[PDB]
Amino acid sequence: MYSFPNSFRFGWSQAGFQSEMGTPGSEDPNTDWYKWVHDPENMAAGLVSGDLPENGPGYWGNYKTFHDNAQKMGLKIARLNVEWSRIFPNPLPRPQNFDESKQDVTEVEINENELKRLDEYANKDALNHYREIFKDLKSRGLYFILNMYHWPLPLWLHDPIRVRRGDFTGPSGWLSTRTVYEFARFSAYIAWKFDDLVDEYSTMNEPNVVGGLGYVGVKSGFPPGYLSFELSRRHMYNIIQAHARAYDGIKSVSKKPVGIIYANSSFQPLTDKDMEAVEMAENDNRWWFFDAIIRGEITRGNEKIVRDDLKGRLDWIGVNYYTRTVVKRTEKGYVSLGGYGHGCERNSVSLAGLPTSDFGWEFFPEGLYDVLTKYWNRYHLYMYVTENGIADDADYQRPYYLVSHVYQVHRAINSGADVRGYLHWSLADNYEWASGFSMRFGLLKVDYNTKRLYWRPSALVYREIATNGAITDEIEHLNSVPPVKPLRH
Numbered sequence: 001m002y003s004f005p006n007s008f009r010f011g012w013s014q015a016g017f018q019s020e021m022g023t024p025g026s027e028d029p030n031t032d033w034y035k036w037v038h039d040p041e042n043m044a045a046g047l048v049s050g051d052l053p054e055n056g057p058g059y060w061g062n063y064k065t066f067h068d069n070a071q072k073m074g075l076k077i078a079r080l081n082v083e084w085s086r087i088f089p090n091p092l093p094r095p096q097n098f099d100e101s102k103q104d105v106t107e108v109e110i111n112e113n114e115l116k117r118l119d120e121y122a123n124k125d126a127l128n129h130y131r132e133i134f135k136d137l138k139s140r141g142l143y144f145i146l147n148m149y150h151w152p153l154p155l156w157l158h159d160p161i162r163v164r165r166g167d168f169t170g171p172s173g174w175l176s177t178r179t180v181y182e183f184a185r186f187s188a189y190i191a192w193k194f195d196d197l198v199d200e201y202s203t204m205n206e207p208n209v210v211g212g213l214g215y216v217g218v219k220s221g222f223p224p225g226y227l228s229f230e231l232s233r234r235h236m237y238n239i240i241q242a243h244a245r246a247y248d249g250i251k252s253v254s255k256k257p258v259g260i261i262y263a264n265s266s267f268q269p270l271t272d273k274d275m276e277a278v279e280m281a282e283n284d285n286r287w288w289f290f291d292a293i294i295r296g297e298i299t300r301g302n303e304k305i306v307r308d309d310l311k312g313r314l315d316w317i318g319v320n321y322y323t324r325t326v327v328k329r330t331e332k333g334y335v336s337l338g339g340y341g342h343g344c345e346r347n348s349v350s351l352a353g354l355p356t357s358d359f360g361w362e363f364f365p366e367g368l369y370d371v372l373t374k375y376w377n378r379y380h381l382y383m384y385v386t387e388n389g390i391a392d393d394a395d396y397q398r399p400y401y402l403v404s405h406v407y408q409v410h411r412a413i414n415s416g417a418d419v420r421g422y423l424h425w426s427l428a429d430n431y432e433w434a435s436g437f438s439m440r441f442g443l444l445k446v447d448y449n450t451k452r453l454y455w456r457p458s459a460l461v462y463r464e465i466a467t468n469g470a471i472t473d474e475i476e477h478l479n480s481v482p483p484v485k486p487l488r489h
């Protein structure tokens with residue numbers, strides 16, 4: 001048996017854009033992502049699948065069913081976001097005496113009156129619908145992590161097609177301090193409306209992937225698909241500040257924990273000569289960011305300084321994990337290797353003989369122990385596993401994936417790391433961004449014609465885990481690698 005603390009909670013994570021739409025009445029056409037996946041030219045290029053999110057699993061209407069299934073599955077924690085676009089679909093008037101050309105955003109003044117002024121702009125039907133969703137959630141004894149942001153921005157803050165075309169005269173998303181300013185205020189507003197329901201907060205989900213795939217990994221078909229190292233850096237600088245300002249915003253209205261959710265890889269050495277490459281990869285993809293919002297340490301210009309408005313802006317770390325990245329040392333630095341981690345053939349085997357998912361991601365659960373213990377030893381902040389799952393419509397690999405990753409969290413806790421829950425990605429299949437609906441991550445299969453949910457056998461396995469608070473003796477064999485001999489090579 002692998003028994004978790006009596007306080008540890010098993011549950012799931014879910015995004016607004018990915019799961020809400022699909023039931024008539026749910027449509028939200030006021031985001032960069034909506035416009036981006038409907039773009040005629042993006043569709044002809046193959047940057048997006050042609051699948052549309054309004055044909056989705058319909059959480060907006062069917063949330064009672066999602067929650068029924070979660071309660072039956074014995075789940076005790078949920079993490080979801082509100083969609084900004086839903087709450088403030090229309091442009092807000094530019095602020096008076098805020099200099100849109102200043103690089104730094106060290107304060108956003110928020111009070112009772114700035115909040116009541118916002119009320120005048122807020123979509124009240126959206127607020128009331130979210131309140132109905134969250135109450136039903138709480139009525140099942142589900143502990144509630146509310147996230148403010150999981151990638152789509154209001155169109156009035158980002159027109160991604162204008163930016164793709166090389167036009168920076170329009171709303172430019174995270175490239176603009178206006179977006180930072182409004183993000184702090186949005187976060188404050190949501191905490192002010194929802195803090196009676198909420199247990200813990202996250203500002204953002206994986207802001208590193210928004211900027212990485214948006215401005216460098218442009219084959220991903222992520223908005224705005226404008227290839228620039230420079231704009232990639234500006235995005236990440238503005239998101240650090242947006243996080244700090246959102247923290248202050250929330251803390252002005254709530255005494256509750258405020259964290260962030262971030263995309264992690266376990267960096268692994270190709271040979272025993274590549275350990276320094278692993279540390280350099282960890283500095284570039286992880287520490288640089290967390291040292292900013294925890295220690296206030298940052299590089300502006302070519303100089304290492306401490307910003308007092310950034311220091312101490314984090315109570316907990318949301319660890320999002322799916323696979324490793326293999327790196328080697330170069331003369332000039334380090335490189336990632338294809339044929340491992342996220343860079344594999346779909347439904348095959350990696351260069352190490354490990355099975356790959358429907359998305360071409362290598363099976364490597366020990367990476368999750370690496371990431372949790374490295375965060376713990378550097379910062380000693382408590383963590384949730386806010387995301388872990390696999391694209392696997394057939395359910396061949398998911399039972400092994402689920403039990404193996406849960407074992408590695410048990411291993412981290414046993415090592416001394418404070419990890420308070422495990423949230424699977426995801427309860428049900430959903431819209432996988434530029435890939436569309438083909439990549440199915442759910443414990444529950446979604447028939448998109450009917451919106452009906454079905455229990456994949458891995459859902460029955462997760463119910464064993466969640467209702468016992470343990471990997472039981474009877475399912476312990478699934479702590480192993482899916483046998484590759486019967487799978488595609």
Ligand SMILES: *[C@H]1C(F)=C(CO)[C@@H](O)[C@H](O)[C@H]1O
Nearest residue numbers: 015205206320322387425432
């Ligand atoms: C985490 C994740 F891995 C997937 C799969 O690509 C996305 O669907 C989530 O939005 C992301 O947070």
